[PDB]
Amino acid sequence: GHMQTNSKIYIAGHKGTAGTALVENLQKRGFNNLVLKTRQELDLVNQQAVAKFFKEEKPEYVFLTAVLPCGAANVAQRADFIYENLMIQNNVIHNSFLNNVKKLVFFGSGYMYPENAKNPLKEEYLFQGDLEYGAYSFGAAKIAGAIMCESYNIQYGTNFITLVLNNLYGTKANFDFGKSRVLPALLRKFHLAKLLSEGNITQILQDLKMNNFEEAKEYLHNFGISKKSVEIWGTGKVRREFIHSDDLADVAIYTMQNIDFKDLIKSKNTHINIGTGIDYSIKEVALMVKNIVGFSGELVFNTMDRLMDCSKIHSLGWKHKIELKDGIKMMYEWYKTQ
């Protein structure tokens, strides 16, 4: 149980999804001594500013959540994904070493694993084939971050642990059209399809912030939403897994308190996959959302699988608490209040 009530804990990237979940869960657990810096206060690409922060604040524990994330919308930023993430990683990990940080947790992505690797993905599949093209430079940076943690642990006897996940979600999602991730996008589609099937024209106009029902029906049809059906743009066979941000926070804190480099060690692949151990076809996710929202209509289909093997984290005494059905239900309850 390494971290104590008054241990100084730095959560890097604290305004992000994982960072917000860590701050909330640490405060609930009674951790009273968090240090938090916005991007405007501390640019983690700038070595001079990061070295100064560590020398002047001397945090004891570090959760490194800050990232330039690689997504469909920003995939053109191929150089930024490698440069900015290597700089964040290098500046935080090295200055943590220089200032005698006790322990650090870093987060990897399943983009670090080969595109053609077998599911479920084992930690030892690192370097067993080429990465997916769009996320190639991002995944290469995450590999370097994992190797940076292990290499410091070996040379300098640091305690820097890498946890690797595929897809993070939480209750308070972004539900904006063409800007929303898979679960929130499906939730909103099914909610609006339900409102259409119930003739709640008034609630449709409120939801879309529109003033003309003919215009609203056109807009909904363009997004495959109708009284009788929701269109899934795909075959429905793409598989997806999910981890709730409260489960990410739980396993990150569990790792900080219990899982040391000692416990993991020609030693290599000392990163640890995290997840729920189960995935879902987009068809299965859609039917689950449909059922939770209570839409009486049909799916219609219109046309890289990633599942972590969680054997290692299970063996080290953590498992997830939040099943996807309960996460989607919490997300929908939140949706209705906003």
Report what 69 binds from ligand NAP, a second copy, none; CB cut-off 5-8 Å by kind.
Answer: ligand NAP
136 lies in the site for a second copy, by CB under 8 A: yes
The nearest distance, CB 94 to a second copy, in angstroms, is 5
Dihedral pair phi/psi, residue 96, rounded to 5°: -65, -50
Instruction: Please choose, from the candidates 141, 20, 11, the residue with its C-alpha nearest in 3D space to the C-alpha of residue 89.
Output: 141
Q: Does 255 bind ligand NAP (CB under 6 A)?
A: no
Nearer to ligand NAP by Cβ, of 164 and 230: the residue is 164
151 binds a second copy per the rule CB under 8 A: yes
Whether residue 120 is preceded by a cis peptide bond, meaning omega within 30 degrees of 0, is yes
- Burial label for 172, CB within 10 Å (0-12, 13-18, 19+), is middle
Residue 18 Cα to chain centre, angstroms: 7
CB atoms within 10 A of CB 214: 8
Exposure of 39 by Cβ count < 10 A (0-12 exposed, 13-18 middle, 19+ buried)? exposed
Query: How many other C-beta atoms lie within 10 A of the C-beta of residue 297?
Result: 17
63 vs 261 by CB, closer to ligand NAP = 63
Per partner kind, with CB cut-offs from 5 to 8 A, the member of a second copy, ligand NAP, none near residue 18 is ligand NAP
- Among residues 2, 34, 80, 207, the one that binds a second copy under rule CB under 8 A: 80
Instruction: Give the pairing type, strands 103-109 and 160-165.
Output: parallel
**For residue 36, how many other CB atoms are within 10 A of its CB?**
15
- Decide if residue 132 touches ligand NAP (CB under 6 A): no
13 touching ligand NAP, by CB under 6 A? yes
- Residue 317 CB: number of other CB atoms within 10 A? 9
Q: Which of 81, 106, 190, 261 binds a second copy (CB under 8 A)?
A: 81
Q: Is 100 in a helix, a strand, or coil? A: coil
Indicate which single residue of 10, 31, 152, 332 sits in contact with a second copy (rule: CB under 8 A): 152
Using CB under 8 A, pick the residue from 7, 17, 47, 200 that binds a second copy: 47
Residue 68 makes contact with ligand NAP by CB under 6 A: yes
Q: Which of 33, 36, 43, 217 binds ligand NAP (CB under 6 A)?
A: 43
Q: Specify whether the CB–CB gap between 155 and 231 falls below 8 A.
A: no
| Antiparallel, parallel or unpaired: β 243-244 and 103-109 | unpaired
Question: In whole angstroms, what is the distance from residue 85 CA to residue 170 CA?
Answer: 23
Binding residues: 13-19, 39, 43-44, 67, 107, 142, 168, 181, 189, 233, 240
| 138 annotated active-site | yes
Of 63, 138, 242, 261, the active-site residue reads 138
Taken in order 192, 195, 196, 197, the sign of the CA dihedral is positive
**From a second copy, ligand NAP, none, which one binds at residue 172 (CB under 5 to 8 Å depending on kind)?**
none
90 interacts with a second copy by CB under 8 A: yes
Known binding site for substrate: residues?
189, 233, 240
Active-site annotation, residues: 138
Residues that bind a second copy (CB under 8 A): 46-48, 76-83, 86-87, 90, 93-94, 97, 114, 126-131, 133, 136-137, 140-141, 143-144, 147-148, 151-152, 154-156, 266, 268
Residues that bind ligand NAP (CB under 6 A): 13, 15-19, 39, 43-45, 65-69, 88, 107, 109, 165, 167-168, 174
